[PDB]
Amino acid sequence: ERGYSFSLTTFSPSGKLVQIEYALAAVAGGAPSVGIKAANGVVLATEKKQKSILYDERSVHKVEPITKHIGLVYSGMGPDYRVLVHRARKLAQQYYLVYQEPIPTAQLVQRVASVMQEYTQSGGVRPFGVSLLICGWNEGRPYLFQSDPSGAYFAWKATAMGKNYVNGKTFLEKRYNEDLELEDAIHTAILTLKESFEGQMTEDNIEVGICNEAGFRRLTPTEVKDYLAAIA
Amino acid sequence: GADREVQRILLELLNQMDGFDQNVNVKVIMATNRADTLDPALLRPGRLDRKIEFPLPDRRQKRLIFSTITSKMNLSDLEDYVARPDKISGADINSICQESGMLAVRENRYIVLAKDFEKAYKTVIKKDEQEHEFYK
Amino acid sequence: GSLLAKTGQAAELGGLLKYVRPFLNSISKAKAARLVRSLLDLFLDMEAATGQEVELCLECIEWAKSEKRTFLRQALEARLVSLYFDTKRYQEALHLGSQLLRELKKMDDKALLVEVQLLESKTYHALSNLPKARAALTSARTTANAIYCPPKLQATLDMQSGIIHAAEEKDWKTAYSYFYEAFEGYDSIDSPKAITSLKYMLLCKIMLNTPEDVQALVSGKLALRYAGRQTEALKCVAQASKNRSLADFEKALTDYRAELRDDP
Amino acid sequence: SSAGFDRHITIFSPEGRLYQVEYAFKAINQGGLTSVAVRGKDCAVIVTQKKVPDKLLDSSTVTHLFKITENIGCVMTGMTADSRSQVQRARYEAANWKYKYGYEIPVDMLCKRIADISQVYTQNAEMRPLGCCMILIGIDEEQGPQVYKCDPAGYYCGFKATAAGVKQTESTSFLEKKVKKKFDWTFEQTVETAITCLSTVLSIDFKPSEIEVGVVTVENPKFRILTEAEIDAHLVALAER
Amino acid sequence: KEQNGDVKEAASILQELQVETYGSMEKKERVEFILEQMRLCLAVKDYIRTQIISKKINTKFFQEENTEKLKLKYYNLMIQLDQHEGSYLSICKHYRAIYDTPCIQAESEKWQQALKSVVLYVILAPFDNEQSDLVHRISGDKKLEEIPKYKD
Amino acid sequence: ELMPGASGAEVKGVCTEAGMYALRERRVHVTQEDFEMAVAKVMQKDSEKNMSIKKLWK
């Protein structure tokens, strides 16, 4: 089994590629991220806690927008996340140029899954060690998707990945209800983050973003602090 | 030869536990840290009827551990320390308490309190990442 | 209706209950159930005249059955079981709760299922049917370890578990731990349940013939916000125990006669 | 449990670890020098230990900190050849940015671009991922001074203060002890705090002629390299106080 | 502070200076102010702190240095602690130890008074095997014949 | 029917666990729910927690 956990172009005699599984394992080691599809929108949160308070928390962002109505968060590597952001933005605006219409989130997820799976085609290029959570609002329906390093993309009413993803998934199973509203979805997401935050989340310690019929936007530290106080 | 002999030992264990000549009033107990690597022939009823999981103490269990190990401790907020979310086992709790006592011995005070107990708590559950931030 | 409810006298509640007759079926099920349960809670908690409360509960039950509001019917049935248990209509409460649980197993609703199971365990304990109460409590715990179980429900379940363990009269450490969990969950959510939980925790400490931990716990940071007559009386009982003066024990019981003897 | 995986950059180890990147991070400390940057309200000061093997060496060419653009300064450590290749690449990127977009590069944008370059470098097996750690400093309008750090992993981050070198851990701890006091850090205070950190992390009480300093302020947008007079004045003023 | 009237604050202030962390040279006779802390805390009458000092003095030898003068002071402090404690066999043992040292063996009146006090301490103690051992070991003492009443 | 692909040894273990459940409540008879939770306990096995891994194949 060792001799086949070394290349991306060789099938293990029993199952499938082992480098893909190792990339997923790297994904599982990332900062926890939680996505929730509410009735009127979608909300994705992540933890930004890092030692050495010297770090400028506003300098980099784990949550970024792709277009006026689609955003994303990541779990796993950072630079790969930025590369995925660049590819998604370029591809979304290419679709916009061809069609003069805001990008359907499903198509963006499909095409970004294709571009990340492209890196898995041959050896010498490692697969992205990042899993994507894509939030969007299109045609009167909030869409939340997960994109894999393997290129697999699927839907999620509410999911949690990264570190401690299994317990967060269980928590989401317990708390999620299909009739959830946006603010209550944010409350549930922040509660999920707190369930494994380990160190008293602050306004900048967590980065959250919400998408609805008014597009997608990352919540400022002010509203994050307000919601944190509301949850307490 | 080595792997063959080890598997012979395992097979003899299986055939003795639930083989031809059944045993009477012979209960076996086997402990492992990685159950998922055990042979399925050993993990079936008739051989290992009950596979009891011993998870890390959860909140209430942590309080029980702290109480039952602090019975021999000195008088000394243990409840808050229990409330702190840390994936630590009963061995870690016994450590924490023992280290608190050791530090109190160092400082020559016969009742531990927040300072040395907290210092021992930090010493025990280090979990210092030393991890390059590009992984997160 | 809101003005009447804020005013809230028995005749006014009686009139209002049928005065919102078209209101019940004019809105969605969730809000209607929430409002009627709020009216029921206020009516039961302010005026304690059991004769009218029980008959109003039965009238609401037949109302819901006629209106075919299944979820609402289950909610009011659970509330009426709680009322019966409070008024110690043991057989009525237990029989109705079992009848409810018979049809509530198949329904996906579990929070109300956990409420019903906990009420059944409470009644079963009040009947000295300790083993069957323990079985019902275990079933409730199992069915709650898979559902939201809000901090109140978690606190209530831990309180009942501590009560059961104490009544078993064999292990107090687990009883102590369950009481501690019930208190901490009841912190900053419901006050009377929190004080009762702290009361039982101190009692459990006393039964461990360790009153010193009681006098340490009363000064504990979380006890101060709930310090008062209850904790002082329990501390007095603890002192009577530690110095082993049953004359002091009886004096403390005479003091309890108003405070902690009518509490089962 | 994972032995052969620490050979190729593009190879994922079990538990999803890339050992080659960590080895490059360790290779950064092969220079043995130390750099540290501190940012104030409107100032940013970088300071680097200077190591002269011989007076034969020309001190004007043995500098370890350089200037990317007229307002953006760079201080870095690691492999010296990797250092110089990285600064050349960064200057190319900044000039191309200016050519294509007609205005100066912000510190964060330059750091992000070179971080993307380094990530592409570490993603494909054709490249040795440029084992040198860089810190860029510069003034951006509406956001004041900016100090950013980029590493061979392609990870860039903004810092209220930062450090690099063999003594990175202790310097970062001292910088944390300094930043927890929440002080405005005027220019002289920034310089003296950085100098104190370097001295206490080296425990040498260096002579004035063994260090280099660069400073960027809003009133002095040009990345000035501190000559001997200014650094001597700063260090003696600190020493008497 | 002894000239001011402060005792509790006084004892605290001279208590915060500990000797366990003190590792530069053995405590020896130089820093005997452990007994000074005992004395100040006795003036505060906070006997538990004195007991803990006595217990934790083990790191600096279980007993004070021999052939010295701080004995009588430390032993009188321990005796007063035990007198309030109510224990007797410990104080009798300490008094016998004081009688043993050559330092007290200069002036006969002190021998008489000390051993008379030891006899009275050992009398009002309860009965056990250790008590019998001590009493019949000291029955053959040749330094009590000068005063026959206490021997009687 | 509650045993998809369960060995005979697992069936005997299920019978034993149902008896154990009855014994816990200090009874002698066993009920249907006893067998149901015995099936749940005996046939319990750890699955693939990671949905990402489980969704590699279509």
Hey, where are the domains in chain A? Answer: 2-231
The torsion of the CA quartet D212, D218, D222, D228, rounded to 10 degrees, works out to -30
SS3 call for A43: strand
Sheet architecture: strand order including A206-212: A158-161, A33-37, A42-47, A206-212, A215-218
For residue B18, give how far its alpha carbon lies from the nearest alpha carbon of chain A (Å).
Answer: 31
Instruction: Note whether C126 and C85 are within 8 A (CB).
Output: yes
User: Smallest CA–CA separation between B101 and chain E, in Å?
Assistant: 14
Three state DSSP letters for A126-151: CCCCEEEEEEEECCCCEEEEEECCCC
CA distance E93 to E151: 18
CA neighbor of C182 nearest in space, from C213, C214, C207, C204: C204
C146 closest CA partner among C101, C97, C111, C112? C111
Give the residue ranges of DSSP H helices in C68-150.
70-86, 90-104, 111-126, 130-144
- Specify whether the CB–CB gap between C202 and C230 falls below 8 A: no
- Distance, CA of E41 to CA of E9 (rounded, Å): 10
Q: Which two tokens stand for residue D100?
A: 């294509």
Q: Is-contact C90 C133, C-beta < 8 A?
A: no
Number of structural domains found in chain D? 1
Q: Which residues of B touch C173 (CB under 8 A)?
A: 64, 67-68
d(CA F41, CA B48): 13
SS3 E6: coil
Interface of E with B in 58-97 (CB under 8 A): 59
Q: A2-231 — its CATH code?
A: 3.60.20.10
CB contact under 8 A, D158 and A27: no
Contact B135 A79 (CB under 8 A): no
Closest of D92, D97, D96 to residue D109, by C-alpha: D97
| Listed residue (A161, A108, A91) closest to A131, CA to CA | A161
Q: How many CB atoms lie within 10 A of CB C97?
A: 29
Q: Which amino acid is located at D8 in the chain? A: H
Q: Breaks in chain A at C–N > 2.5 Å: after which residues?
A: none
* Cβ–Cβ gap D157/B134 under 8 Å: no
Structural resolution in Å = 3.1
Of B60, B67, B77, the CB nearest to C181: B60
* Alpha-carbon gap, residue C251 to D48, rounded angstroms: 79
Give D157's contacts in chain B (Cβ within 8 Å).
Answer: 133
- Residue in E33, E36, E78 with CA at minimum distance from that of residue E55: E78
Find the largest Cα–Cα distance for chain F.
49
Which secondary structure element, helix H or strand E, spans residue A59, and what is its range? Answer: none
Chains A and F are in contact, defined as 3 or more C-beta pairs closer than 8 angstroms: yes
Long-range contacts of F11-20 (CB under 8 A, 24+ apart): F12/B45, F12/B46, F13/B44, F13/B45, F13/B46, F13/B49, F13/F42, F14/B45, F14/F38, F14/F39, F14/F42, F14/F43, F16/B45, F16/B49, F17/B49, F17/F41, F17/F42
Q: Determine contact: B136 vs chain A, CB below 8 A.
A: yes
| Phi/psi-derived region of residue A124, left when phi > 0, alpha when psi is between -120 and 50, beta in every other case | left
Q: Is D32 exposed, middle or buried (0-12, 13-18, 19+ CB in 10 A)?
A: exposed
Q: Is F27 left (phi over 0), alpha (psi -120 to 50) or beta?
A: beta
Chain A residue numbers touching F51 (CB-CB < 8 A): 146, 154, 159, 169
- Contact status of B55 with chain C (Cβ, < 8 Å): no
Is A215:A103 a contact under the CB 8 Å cutoff?
Answer: no
- Answer whether E59 sits within 8 Å of B108, measured CB to CB: yes
Are B134 and D22 a contacting pair at CB < 8 A?
Answer: no
Taking the CA of residue F20 and the nearest CA in chain C, the distance in Å comes to 14
- B121 Cβ contact partners less than 8 Å away, ≥ 6 residues apart: B81, B96, B100
- CB neighbours of residue C106 within 10 Å: 6
Name the nearest CA neighbour of D159 among D18, D35, D25.
D35
Are B133 and D155 an interchain contact pair (Cβ–Cβ within 8 Å)?
yes
Q: Measured between beta carbons, which residues in chain E are less than 8 angstroms from residue B106?
A: 20
What is the DSSP pairing of strand D43-49 with strand D34-39? Answer: antiparallel
Reduced 3-state DSSP string for B55-103: CCCCCHHHHHHHHHHHCCCCCCCHHHHHHCCCCCCHHHHHHHHHHHHHH
Which residue of chain F has the CA closest to A15?
F57
Neighbours of A5 (CB within 10 A): 20
Is the Cα dihedral D196, D202, D208, D214 positive or negative? negative
Considering only CB atoms, A21 lies closest to which of F53, F55, F57, namely F53
Kindly identify which residue of chain F lies nearest to residue B35, measuring between CA atoms. Answer: F46
Listed in sequence order, the residues at least 6 apart from C38 whose beta carbon sits closer than 8 Å to its beta carbon are C5
How far off is chain C from A172, nearest CA to CA, in Å? 9
**Considering only alpha carbons, which residue of chain D is nearest residue B136?**
D155
Alpha-carbon distance values, B67 to A198, B62, B97, C162, C213 (Å): 23, 9, 10, 17, 11
| Mutation site for B-interface testing, chosen from E17, E56, E61 by largest number of B Cβ within 10 Å | E56
**Any idea what DSSP says for residue D6?**
S
Report whether C260 contacts C252 (CB < 8 A).
no
Instruction: Pick from A51, A60, A205 the residue to mutate for testing the B interface (most B CBs within 10 Å).
Output: A51
Q: How far apart are the first and last CA of chain D?
A: 55
Task: Using CB atoms within 10 Å of the CB of residue E18, give its burial: 0 to 12 exposed, 13 to 18 middle, 19+ buried.
Answer: middle
Name the token pair of F20: 């154990």
CB pairs < 8 Å spanning C and F: 3
Amino acid letter at C190? Answer: D
Give the neighbours of chain D: at least 3 Cβ pairs within 8 Å: A, B
Report CA E107 to chain centroid distance, whole Å: 20
Burial code of E45-78, b = ≥16 C-beta within 10 A, e = fewer? eebebbbebbebbeebeeebeeeeeebeebbbbb
A–C interface: beta-carbon pairs under 8 A:
5
Residue pair A45/A189 in contact (Cβ under 8 Å)? The answer is yes
Residue C238's contacts (CB-CB under 8 Å, 6 or more residues apart) are C202, C205, C206, C211, C214, C215
Positive or negative torsion for Cα A18, A24, A27, A32 = negative
CATH of the domain at D134: 3.60.20.10
Question: Which of B58, B59, B60, B84 would best serve as a mutation to test chain C binding (most C beta carbons within 10 A)?
Answer: B60
Q: How far does chain C reach from its first CA to its final CA, in angstroms?
A: 38
Domain boundaries, chain C: 1-264
Domain that holds residue D213: 1-241
DSSP element (H, E) containing A35: strand A33-37
From A31, A195, A198, residue closest to B136, measured CB to CB: A31
Kindly determine whether residue D25 and residue B132, on different chains, have CB atoms separated by under 8 Å: yes
Report how many Cβ contacts below 8 Å link chain B to chain E: 11
Instruction: CATH number for C1-264: choose from 3.10.20.30, 1.10.3720.10, 1.25.40.570, 3.40.1010.10.
Output: 1.25.40.570
Closest by Cα among E72, E70, E96, E92 to E82: E92
- DSSP for E12-34? HHHHSS-SSS--SS--TTT--HH
Contact: D120, A19; criterion CB under 8 Å: no
Give the residue from A31, A153, A149, A144 showing the smallest Cα distance to A84: A149
For D7-27, b/e burial (b = at least 16 CB within 10 A) is ebbbbbbeebbbbbbbebbeb
Answer whether B67 touches C (CB < 8 Å): yes
